[PDB]
Symmetry: C3
Subunit: 185 residues, 3 copies
């Protein structure tokens, strides 16, 4: 079965794939679909190691950066959460095609609408209230910023879940969380 | 084709079509639209009979499940909310098509991404903070769960609204609630 | 076909196109993408002149209306926030096409789902918690009402950010906010 050019993801159930604090200490599920000038996306993050399994007082916020180049290609180089060997790309069945992204701009956040320097402007963010573990008694905040950590010629997505301190010695895991944005192309 | 193979709804303004506590006590308006690997969803529930008109001290939550067979076809028997006489199929103008769903899996929550056993797992859930009757002064939580009330080959969607206990004798009407999930196929 | 007949926006980085409190005192960024029976929209508003830079103790709500006609076309007169000169049409490159919208209704809110004499009805409203300036400590709400200010034959989209009164002397800015709804056609 062919791959889907409107869909980039990390596969429905990735093995640990992000080294946020320690090696492969988090399991990141990310699906980005292109719906015309808008990409509808869903993300989830569950800790499997260290502080992610047991939030410390310093684990105030958990975040993941995904840096893209001028053509919208993910750069595994740090600060990119995804390890340079984890699967990321076009959906193909329950897996990821080996074809390189040739329509990445259609997946990158529009710089005109979201400038590379203006990573602090309100509009370069979509903010929501969600719950830790899915429990309505453990609220936290998910900030998603665009082009907030680029490279003069590239793109990015950042995910920040704040308000954790209140939940020390508790596993960090978010529900399936949605977000959307205007595409560069 | 006279219909939209990419949409399955209950029609825009359906009559009572659910029996949550007593027979036909609620109107469910549901639209599921597929775009690649994701389904955008909008749901709305308006109580019309019994406890749904007047919330009781013990009425703490209000939910509706929807179970599907191994081919994404809705099974209209408990615990499914929508009754046998209810409209449900692909959009065709303002009505539903009588054609059977040949692409049901395309609208089902991914079992790999949302396991049958792991229903309590934060990932199998999209939760938020919505408001009763669309009143910002009356916040209530909503939790959409994927595949937590299935039957080995089946699939399901579950909508739970809680924190209602503090609105005794008020009518139960939710605002239009958005949601989404990674599809099976 | 250079433009995209599935997107209706105001281009990504538009000049002040709103005169909410005083002339051209606010920039409104709006993108509506059609994905079958549902539309995925992203709203964004920032104040640049007058009271919008300093929230008053009585200013609990700040908002804009967009009124369309029988064919889903924008009426640049009151109550429509967007001034006559403001860019608005099909996305073409980073600008807008000159082609008159020939399918406005596919972007309009379904009147059967969202009735005119029912703007108050919970269903005719999608509500969420968001944050002023995108500051996770400055929560507020956004209400998107469907067909609440029309012309019997018209359609509309009303966005109202509230819970601002307790932020006096602060510049009004909102993050990019998501919303969606069932289409007429």
């Amino acid at each position: 079965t062919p791959y889907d050019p409107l869909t980039l993801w990390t596969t429905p159930d990735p093995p640990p794939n992000c080294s946020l604090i320690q090696e492969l200490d988090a399991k990141l599920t990310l699906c980005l679909t292109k719906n015309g000038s808008i990409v509808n996306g869903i993300v989830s993050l569950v800790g499997v190691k260290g502080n992610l399994l047991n939030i410390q007082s310093t684990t105030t916020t958990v975040g993941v950066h995904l840096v893209f180049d001028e053509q919208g290609r993910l750069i595994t180089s740090t600060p990119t959460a995804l390890v340079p060997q984890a699967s990321w790309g076009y959906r193909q069945g329950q897996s990821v095609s080996t074809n390189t992204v040739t329509n990445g701009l259609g997946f990158m956040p529009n710089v005109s609408a979201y400038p590379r320097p203006n990573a602090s402007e309100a509009k370069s963010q979509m903010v929501s209230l969600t719950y830790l573990q899915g429990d309505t008694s453990k609220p936290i905040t998910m900030k998603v910023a665009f082009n907030g950590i680029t490279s003069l010629n590239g793109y990015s997505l950042t995910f920040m879940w704040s308000g954790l301190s209140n939940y020390i010695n508790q596993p960090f895991s978010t529900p399936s969380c949605s977000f959307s944005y205007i595409t560069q192309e």
